[PDB]
Amino acid sequence: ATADTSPERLAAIAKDALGALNDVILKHGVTYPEYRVFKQWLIDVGEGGEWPLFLDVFIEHSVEEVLARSRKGTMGSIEGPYYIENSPELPSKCTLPMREEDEKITPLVFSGQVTDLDGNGLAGAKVELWHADNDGYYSQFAPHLPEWNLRGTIIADEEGRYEITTIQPAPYQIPTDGPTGQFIEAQNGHPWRPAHLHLIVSAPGKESVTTQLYFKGGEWIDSDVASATKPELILDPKTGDDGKNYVTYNFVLDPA
Amino acid sequence: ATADTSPERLAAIAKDALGALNDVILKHGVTYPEYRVFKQWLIDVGEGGEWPLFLDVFIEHSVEEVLARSRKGTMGSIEGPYYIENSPELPSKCTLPMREEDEKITPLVFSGQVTDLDGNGLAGAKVELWHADNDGYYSQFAPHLPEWNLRGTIIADEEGRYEITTIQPAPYQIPTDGPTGQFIEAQNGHPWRPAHLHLIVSAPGKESVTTQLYFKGGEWIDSDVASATKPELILDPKTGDDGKNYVTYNFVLDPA
Ligand SMILES: Oc1cccc(O)c1O
Ligand SMILES: Oc1cccc(O)c1O
Ligand SMILES: [Fe+3]
Ligand SMILES: [Fe+3]
Fold first, then answer.
1. B224: part of which helix (H) or strand (E)?
2. Which atom of ligand 2 approaches the CA of B212 most closely?
3. d(CA A83, CA B168)
4. Pair B36, B77 in one domain
5. Strands A172-173 and A192-193
6. Which of helix, strand or coil describes residue A247?
7. Greatest distance between any 2 Cα atoms in chain B
8. Where would one find the signal peptide in this protein (chains A, B)?
9. Cβ pair B30:A52 closer than 8 A
10. CATH number for B48
């Protein structure tokens, strides 16, 4: 991973980041035993492979908020730690790979269109979808699951349209057996994210969107630990007489 | 390492620390490639065993500045990553353990007294001294060196007095082969600390001081990378006709 960032810009960034932390230490009169604890915790985070976790939960939202200012299309949200490139392709109407366990869950039938800013539909458009099972696990991050469980790259039709069936997602708890969970327990916080779908939406000559969709009335939307929920990204699915949840959502892409 | 810190206090601390970093990201419009770089770097820091290094260089000064407000005695400074408890004891007049290589360097003869706040001298007083050799290495952090090279716990006399001979320290460069060195190179900074002695000064029923002594006119005192130099901690040794550097410095301890 490489970035074009000047010595100048890094210097200014570092200056107020360090300045900022240092001022927090001065403000609260952080002590030597606390500095000790903070230092051990930083070590434990890395030793626990939790940098992607801690940073995406606690910091990434700021980074998207930056990106957000330059974009007129569908609201984005954080990627999170669990995205895997090249999930196998599916046709514009499809059902996500899933186990027999998953088939037991209320289906969710997610329809819509990928359009440009003027509302025109786009051919060659892809919706990469991923989310957790009802147990709270993500495939390839849980050894029991098939590697593409609840993951696919949906090939939208010539109109930019898709109809994707999956399971209704459930509120999800971040891992709490390690230093991120410790950091949350020590301050009486909670480790919950709302029920969500993760998506990256793309089309030839367009700027992709990495986003998340949430469910109206769902638990923790007002208190997402990752601070990644936006009012515009909340779905209101209607129940069918087949008992499936139905919802239509359109994506609106900026030009690249 | 454990601290008595309430869920409340940790929550308030975390809030503005995260708030602070997040505001820096917003201020400078930190981008996704940069967030990527920052995330890889955090991983590399831990993988490189550089948390003690990075934090002591870039953060500890704030933590001492906190401690500093409550103390009337000799100015403190940061401990740094290289302190080792229980260096072998030496008599109040002594010379530090050293190699034949070291014997070649201008001697430094460091005299003084440990006193209370009213200027009274203290029996049972200890001066734990450590510093780098002229090559820039610290013992037990460089496989070629005897484990106590330039380290000792000096037993001051019934008056609180000591006379300690060692080598004149030289400006010292922090390791730059890893992520801390990378962080400094990318912003065109420098990796230098001034020539310094490290000391922890203690006496029965007194609050210890962890401090550093520096040398007048020495290189980098105005630009210490660790931001740990204070005007009050600068020595002005006089040269003898034996060609040794001579200096007297007194310690003043607060009550525990
Ligand atoms: O952004 C996130 C952070 C942690 C866990 C997740 O499932 C997630 O989407
Ligand atoms: O505080 C310090 C930080 C890095 C290297 C040192 O020798 C030191 O005293
Ligand atoms: Fe997720
Ligand atoms: Fe040092």
1. none
2. 9
3. 56
4. no
5. antiparallel
6. strand
7. 63
8. none
9. no
10. 6.10.10.40
Conformational region of residue A19, where left means phi above 0, alpha means psi within -120 to 50, and beta covers everything else: alpha
Amino acid (1-letter code) at residue B212: Q
Going by their DSSP bridges, the two strands B206-207 and B172-173 should be labelled as: unpaired
Residues preceding chain discontinuities in chain B with C to N over 2.5 Å:
none
Structure tokens at A250: 């359109």
Judge whether A192 and A226 are in contact, CB under 8 Å: no
B5–A186 C-beta distance less than 8 A: yes
Last residue of a domain, one of B48, B71, B94: B71
Query: Which residues of chain A have a CB within 8 Å of the CB of B60?
Result: 35
Q: What is the resolution of the experimental data for this entry, in Å?
A: 2.0
Helix H or strand E segment including A130: strand A126-130
Determination approach: X-ray
- Out of A50, A71, A92, pick the residue that ends a domain: A71
Contact criterion met (CB below 8 Å) for B67 and A31: yes
Range of the domain at A24: 1-71
Chain position carrying tokens 């779908």: A197
Q: Given the structure tokens 């407000």, which residue do they identify?
A: B69
Edge-first strand listing for the sheet containing B126-130: B89-91, B151-155, B126-130, B196-202, B209-215, B234-235
| CATH number of the domain that residue A218 is part of | 2.60.130.10
Please say whether the beta carbons of A83 and A132 come within 8 A.
Answer: no
Q: What is the distance between the alpha carbons of residues B228 and B250, in angstroms, rounded to a whole number?
A: 19
Length of chain A: 256
Amino acid at A252: V
A68–B contact, CB cutoff 8 A? no
